[PDB]
Amino acid sequence: AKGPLQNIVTWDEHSLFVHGERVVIFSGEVHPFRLPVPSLYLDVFHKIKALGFNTVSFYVDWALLEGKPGRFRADGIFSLEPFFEAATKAGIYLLARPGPYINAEVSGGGFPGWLQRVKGKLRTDAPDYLHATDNYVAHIASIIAKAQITNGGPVILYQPENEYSGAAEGVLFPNKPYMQYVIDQARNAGIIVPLINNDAFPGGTGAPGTGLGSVDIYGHDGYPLGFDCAHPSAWPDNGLPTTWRQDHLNISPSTPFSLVEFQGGAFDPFGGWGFEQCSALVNHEFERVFYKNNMAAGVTIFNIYMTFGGTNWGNLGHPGGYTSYDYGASIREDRRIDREKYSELKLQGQFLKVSPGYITATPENATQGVYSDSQNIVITPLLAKESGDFFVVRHANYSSTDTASYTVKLPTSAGDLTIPQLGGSLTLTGRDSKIHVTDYPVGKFTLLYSTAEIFTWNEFAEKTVLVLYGGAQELHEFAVKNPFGSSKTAKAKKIEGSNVTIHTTSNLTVVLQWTASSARQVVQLGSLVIYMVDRNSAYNYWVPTLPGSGKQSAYGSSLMNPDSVIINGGYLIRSVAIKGNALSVQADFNVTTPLEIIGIPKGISKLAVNGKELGYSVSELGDWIAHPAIEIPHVQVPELTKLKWYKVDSLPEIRSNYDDSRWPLANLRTSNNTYAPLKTPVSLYGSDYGFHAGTLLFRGRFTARTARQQLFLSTQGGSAFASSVWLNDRFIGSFTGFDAASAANSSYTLDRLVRGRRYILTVVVDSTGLDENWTTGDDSMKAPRGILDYALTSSSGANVSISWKLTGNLGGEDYRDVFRGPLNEGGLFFERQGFHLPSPPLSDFTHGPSSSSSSSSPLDGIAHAGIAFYAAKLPLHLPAQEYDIPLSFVFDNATAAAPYRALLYVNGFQYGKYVSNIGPQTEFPVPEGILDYNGDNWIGVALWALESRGAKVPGLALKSKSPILTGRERVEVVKGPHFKKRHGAY
Ligand SMILES: *[C@@H]1O[C@H](CO)[C@@H](O[C@@H]2O[C@H](CO)[C@@H](O[C@@H]3O[C@H](CO[C@H]4O[C@H](CO)[C@@H](O)[C@H](O[C@H]5O[C@H](CO)[C@@H](O)[C@H](O)[C@@H]5O)[C@@H]4O)[C@@H](O)[C@H](O[C@H]4O[C@H](CO)[C@@H](O)[C@H](O)[C@@H]4O[C@H]4O[C@H](CO)[C@@H](O)[C@H](O)[C@@H]4O[C@H]4O[C@H](CO)[C@@H](O)[C@H](O[C@H]5O[C@H](CO)[C@@H](O)[C@H](O)[C@H]5O)[C@@H]4O)[C@@H]3O)[C@H](O)[C@H]2NC(C)=O)[C@H](O)[C@H]1NC(C)=O
Ligand SMILES: *[C@@H]1O[C@H](CO)[C@@H](O[C@@H]2O[C@H](CO)[C@@H](O[C@@H]3O[C@H](CO[C@H]4O[C@H](CO)[C@@H](O)[C@H](O[C@H]5O[C@H](CO)[C@@H](O)[C@H](O)[C@@H]5O[C@H]5O[C@H](CO)[C@@H](O)[C@H](O)[C@@H]5O)[C@@H]4O)[C@@H](O)[C@H](O[C@H]4O[C@H](CO)[C@@H](O)[C@H](O)[C@@H]4O)[C@@H]3O)[C@H](O)[C@H]2NC(C)=O)[C@H](O)[C@H]1NC(C)=O
Ligand SMILES: *[C@@H]1O[C@H](CO)[C@@H](O[C@@H]2O[C@H](CO)[C@@H](O)[C@H](O)[C@H]2NC(C)=O)[C@H](O)[C@H]1NC(C)=O
Ligand SMILES: CC(C)S[C@@H]1O[C@H](CO)[C@H](O)[C@H](O)[C@H]1O
Ligand SMILES: *[C@@H]1O[C@H](CO)[C@@H](O)[C@H](O)[C@H]1NC(C)=O
């Protein structure tokens, strides 16, 4: 790596530059494959843009786009085109991360299952691995090359590989010819923007100056609280990073300090704590302490992993997680933005994008008792000669929940000052951190200093507006250099409030002190107006940007200090636009509120909200106060217990009349799997036959030699898998599973056999996905699914032979549903036939009345070990044009009940794997778009009873959240194919 290849995106020691403008890149992670509704990408981008972010980072999952080797497919819900269109419509730029290896808590870490048939070590220069990646990278890097900013699209940065940071003992690391082959595949496909990487810690791998294999910008990661959410109020001793500014200078001083993945929540395993508990550990207090600690090191490329997580639909997840990927993130799985951490993150994003002096100040070592007399606080300075200083204040023990009183002694253009200058003490309450400034520019005005934090500021036609905030009951002080210009007449004017005090010095510096509360203070100094609010009021302010013109209109006038309107009130402001003499606002409301508009453009005299004209009062400052109609209705949804349910047996294999002559034979006498050498006469691994998704079945034939025989069976499905075994139609037993078991050794007696007669063993093995491969040189993704070993012995000790057949999803790598993708279906009978699809063939099902002997409802269930599938029509007629109403399906977990596993289907898409004896998930959200809110829907529930007594669902209900009055763009329903009879099915 030797410099940029184009002039649109460039960099230096301090920052990136875009179209020649220095910018702080503040980015959120979103994964397109975890939200398969193209018309909702714009809703998520409106919510990230309103935080004050300018960028989104995204993975691409190889396993979804090349499920058959040699056939790349990215159409319909798998296309990136509507994701790229929505980024341009919202005015957001993108960091593309296509792998080939992505980790991401997805099945295989992104590697398709057919890589288990590749002999050489993954993520090395073994030639069989390298040549297996060539077709995927050629197609995906060419799609992303067309969407680059150099061709008028949103793509500004590209990451090759993922977290390439160490290796197993006796494996070459770093392997520099391997790193350079990965970079060459991307360059050869047309990628010309800069390359960035994401090292696990500051190890220096791939940094500029390391020769063969190096990227353009060196990046690293940080997850200082780790991933166990057991104790959400405990922060470890020594858990805060204090060496990253020095480590950056030691490794790559020539490029911007970059955190390519920094903690925005945590993943959670089967048997874990739930994402509500993860959101309480990684909360608004975590954000203000740890994120301002990264600003104290001078970060200028900063991405939050995850910002919106979405859902692991259609088996796309790994065994180490379950269906939800909410992550405890700032935007929830259902797209609501009510968590307090969303409102706190907005305060930080709007401050940085109005503060260009931050980029060029130089960070220095942390100090104690230098910038304050107090030794109970620590202060890290960022210094510059004239353009402004910043100071990040925290408790000396970073974990402290105590309140500290303090003063500061700060350098300014008027000399060193102890502040407050008008008397009194500052306060730092528990788990808080503050940025104080000196010589901070506000358009044509200058703040000599401020202790209160800056939300936003802008210059308008008739005034300049500044918005400052403090936590409630905190004393704050700030000073403004002479705001009156020439006039030795002019004086301050108090417009609102009775707590603020104003003192003027003889050189006309104006000093203001106030105590923050619910009651806003407002003061006018000449044409400068200052609004002084508490933190909780600042949470409801918004700063939408005014559009420019042409294809790039949503990117506004510039990325830093853009033309804007300031709005006080509302659950979300999405956008503003000018049309003749009217200002038009798109907004969402979850509660009643007025709206106050500050900074009306010149010549505008009418107001509309969501397409409707309304009147307004005018304040003496020229702000407009308006009262939109907000009705929040009572919503009624259909009761699921009252639908007309139909039922079909989904284990016909154990019946005497069953014909398996269409099933694949398991007759491979050798395997290419080098990680798990064969212990059996033939391979019983699903991936050796093309089956990589969901449940597997095996059928083993033997001739009885004695009346009693003993069976040893070793099975493997991934963490929290289960397996069940039948001998003809007789149930033998289940391994019922637990969070800590990925494999099981079982021993069963097969009794009462007739000598000389043929018997068939049916073995069902669930898979919860393919494992990741995060240590290069340990091929852990190749751990097989199915049967690892077995022995069948007569009562005299002789060995008895078994011959085998097997199946996963119908067709394997030749998968049948091209619209919904290669992983959506597993191998259970109802899936192979397509009976999960809309408009199923009801003459192949049964119907009977609930709470009777012949019930066809999942609330009544089945009375023996086995597997049944249930389907019903669900009509919806909700006011989706005017309201956003989030819907979810809820299972009741009733302490005393037999163990079972369930699968949830909606309009043909699998939207849940429920495991009653492992948990933690009971509530399953499904998005508008997969659901039709004004038409018929088809719902599906598979039920697998693990014990001899059978099982039932104790309760199942549809739940709504409080409705949101909405100005989003309309959601289009995803039109997946309905049932059609499948030729060659079994
Ligand atoms: C419906 O409601 C019912 C209740 O009526 C719910 O059922 C209950 O569900 C829970 C949760 O699944 C069950 O509790 C777990 O049981 C596990 C199996 O225990 C059996 O097998 C054990 C192993 O052989 C055996 O030791 C056990 O013996 C003990 O307990 C029995 C009591 O039955 C007793 O007789 C014995 O004397 C002995 O004391 C037992 O026979 C068990 O493995 C689980 O252990 C974990 O939790 C407890 C703490 O809560 C710990 O003390 C353990 O050390 C262990 O800790 C791991 O897991 C937690 C939680 O995630 C984590 O915080 C730990 O750090 C540790 O993590 C690591 O291991 C786990 C695997 O165990 C991995 O997943 C992790 O992996 C990832 O995570 C890391 C970050 O954390 C990340 O860094 C890694 O990269 C990543 O891989 C870590 O490796 C529990 O005890 C109940 O048994 C069950 N109760 C009943 C009555 O049935 C049901 O869940 C509900 N359903 C729904 C839908 O909600
Ligand atoms: C419509 O949409 C809006 C958003 O637009 C939603 O409003 C949000 O609703 C959520 C859910 O209720 C709110 O979050 C929860 O907030 C509570 C209440 O505490 C907050 O508000 C009060 C003012 O009423 C503040 O005083 C609180 O701040 C103090 O306490 C916190 C510690 O919690 C501390 O960090 C602060 O610095 C501050 O401490 C100072 O004062 C205290 C006095 O107590 C003093 O002792 C100390 O020394 C300092 O002086 C806070 O801002 C809060 O209890 C909850 O937290 C708990 O749970 C979460 C997990 O869920 C944990 O992370 C946490 O650790 C706690 O255990 C939540 O944070 C959110 O604030 C609110 N947002 C807005 C903008 O209003 C609506 O809900 C939506 N409505 C519908 C119908 O959809
Ligand atoms: C730093 O401050 C934290 C939080 O106040 C201290 O954590 C407390 O530690 C004590 C004793 O270990 C416990 O009884 C409390 O329950 C802890 N509180 C919380 C919120 O976790 C911590 O001990 C201090 N560490 C140092 C090195 O002083
Ligand atoms: C521990 C990190 C440095 S690797 C980091 O971990 C994340 C955890 O959610 C995801 O798996 C990312 O894909 C991986 O890059
Ligand atoms: C193993 O490797 C080679 C790759 O060329 C392939 O031709 C062969 O069919 C594979 N064998 C098995 C058992 O997968």
Ligand SMILES: *[C@@H]1O[C@H](CO)[C@@H](O)[C@H](O)[C@H]1NC(C)=O
């Ligand atoms: C099962 O038994 C074999 C010995 O046959 C042993 O090698 C393996 O570790 C065991 N697996 C489990 C999950 O106990």
